[PDB]
Amino acid sequence: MVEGVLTIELSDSVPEEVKEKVKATVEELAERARKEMGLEVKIEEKDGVITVKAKGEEEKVKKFFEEVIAALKKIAAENGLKVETELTEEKAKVENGKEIKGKITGKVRISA
Secondary structure, eight states: OEEEEEEEEEOTTSOHHHHHHHHHHHHHHHHHHHHHHTOEEEEEEETTEEEEEEEEOHHHHHHHHHHHHHHHHHHHHHHTOEEOOOEEEEOOEEETTEEEOOEEEEOOEEEO
């Protein structure tokens, strides 16, 4: 079980269109994937900074990582929006006997 906390920070200069339409699509695919796959796909937005924390197994979270990355790079390229993006996967390690699980932490940034 790993926790895929993809953080979607939209720039202050992005149109209101980008806010409404990106949330429409993210919360759509997340609602459906949460319901059908039976996982803890947490949607949030703090002051314009969206957060999709999809908690599940490695195979699950990394599959959704491929789907979200393919989606955002597609929209980024065709619209001319710089999604800089980065991924920091904190590896599952038993340190001092403490079985610390993995976190797939993204820092993706929609820049218009």
